[PDB]
């Protein structure tokens, strides 16, 4: 969990371990929305739905992982990782497994702050959906419901 | 080993990681004994035994972990991880898996130190004995032997 | 990843950990070779070559991994994971996974650095060759091809 | 400046020093308004004022120095210290001087953030007014004017 | 304060800083006895006596900050320093000044714990006394008093 | 010493302290040279004269503290400070005054190493000469000899 998102969470380059930080873990509603509140007060917005019916789901349970990195010995920066701690009842598990990477790149010439949402390429019963990496839209993620019988 | 051990010990809420600190790899006696005493020096006392004879097992190796996370960014908690380095000869492999936590919680009214022992449930060949979680017995540790033929 | 090259480089006895480093992800040429220069400008020099053939691999792409650990309290390790991201095309996956590990050990007693370089003990499409644990010789490290039909 | 701002945020007894933080230097306007924004959020807020005319002063030079302490070892303590780097010309100068000391004591049984206000007592040009210690009203801040002939 | 002890603290060679620590403020008895326990559980007694009198003196403030230093890259250093807040009433002021350095050296060869006690060379009015630097005996605090008319 | 090495260290801005280092204390030689290499391999140069004959002076003490800052929340800056230990005999005592600034701004355009020497403006018995601040040529250092008689 903690290292799978932090190897996930690092970039392409020299660089260096500075926090390791988490939120709290989160239960999502009958809305299946799932609300993260960056350090820099921007809200990703997530949201559980059937892989198939595409219903939005409850019970799910998640956790934002956020990472300090020095990087190429001249930056600081801040990845983001969620992970799907548990997946709603009667879908097929998915137990602590990394799920989005969020990476928070502010613009060195005097810019506004720039989010990009990244998929984590792993196979797994859970997975995020495809979209340019932008917070501009809620970004879905597919739960594979286990069939009985 | 040590993410799973992490994993383990995190808490709920909002935490930061501090500290990752790590005791010796001890080997048990015939007596399967097993002494981990903690910062505040108390003893915490397992014992690895066989999980049909009973039987005190020598060989096992374990390792203690140590962490320190800030809790709701107001605490400073202390999550001990128990884990089996190897199963002794002769009994299912048990590589690197955490078997037990313990958790520091001093109590802030100016009480005394309250210490609380939890298992790693997680299907392994070893595994904790089922107790109420304080330090007052001995807690047993149940290894399955390896059948041959 | 980080933890399995932690958990490889965490030696025996009290410990602590300090930093978390690594370097870039490099890409073996056609002469198979990967040169990672520690801390203090030694070159470790390995070689990614076919298990049957022998040949030479380019396509791998390699990360070196930089831990230090506070030993029994009295001494400051340097310990070096190196870890394969990515076989070579056309070859058994190997994703992540430990390769090698390399320790820095100073003589107390006013001596010169001194390198040991051992092997992972994981099962994997990739391993390092047996060789007295030296930076006096290339060590090399085999891969195995994915035989088709 | 940074230790006799330490010093004056360490409180009494066991602690530890966990990270050393600093705002931006800021200049008082005419208005002599100094607005420091805790990591809660909430505004503390002083004034730089003539000793005797009272009037507000400008071109006083403020830094806000942030400390978090490991109390007890079991607290989290996060004690702020207000700087003056630079009187306001013409008066007497006071350089990197320590002023007013800021505590958040959070309640452990689930109550709001509680703030506290102290004075340093170092016998200096400048000095902080004396008030209960709350976040309610402004703080002045009195600077001796430099008398000529 | 802090810094006047970590200067103190810094031996000689490439270093880094680690922790700083400190213990809670003692206030001496008639007995005018200090005793320090260190973090490998020795007690440093130390006892503050009138420069010419040689009466133990009650009322006296003393602090102890323990720093751990990274020594040439090989060693971790745990030097400690007593500071001194507040002299007895009716005696020299002493406000926050460094007395005596202990540092335990850790023979490396498999010896046990040596301590050595240092002395600051600050002019003061308070100074540890001249003796073989060993925590054999205690070790006096003169401080001069504050003649009247 | 160590602190007012970190205050003419601190930019301006929001900051956080990351690490504290030192070198091995010098001493001058005859040639009056200081050689310090800093962490990216280049020599800054000084050189300790006397204020009116200019004559090299041996004897001078130095230690070089390092300091790593990380600024406005985006970068890691890497400030270099230079303190004079002790006067050389029969010139007026500098005991742990800084006297220079190192800063070490890499220009993020994919630019190369840039290196600026500041000159601490604190009244003492030495102190660095007025030059365009680049490591271009060599920086003298002035020590006012104490007259006898």
């Known amino acids: 969990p903690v290292e799978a998102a932090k ?3 690092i970039a392409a380059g020299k660089g260096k371990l500075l926090r390791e ?9 009958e809305d299946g929305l799932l609300e993260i509140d960056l350090e ?16 939005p789901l409850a019970g799910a349970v998640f956790r934002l ?18 992970v799907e701690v548990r997946s709603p009842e009667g879908y ?3 137990v602590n497994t990394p799920i989005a990477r969020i990476t928070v790149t502010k613009d060195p010439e005097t810019g506004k702050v720039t989010y990009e949402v990244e998929a984590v390429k792993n196979g ?20 594979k419901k286990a069939v009985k019988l």
Chains 1, 2, 3, 4, 5, 6 share one sequence.
């Open 65 to 82: 992982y956020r990472f300090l990195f020095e990087e190429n010995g001249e930056f600081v920066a801040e990845r983001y990782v969620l």
């Open 40 to 55: 820099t007060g921007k809200k990703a917005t997530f949201q559980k739905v059937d892989a198939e019916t595409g219903k």
């Open 7 to 9: 190897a996930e969470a």
């Open 21 to 29: 930080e988490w939120s709290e873990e989160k239960t999502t509603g």
């Open 124 to 143: 797994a019963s859970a997975s995020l959906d495809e979209q340019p990496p932008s917070l501009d839209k809620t970004r879905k993620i597919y739960n």
């Open 92 to 94: 097929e598990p998915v």
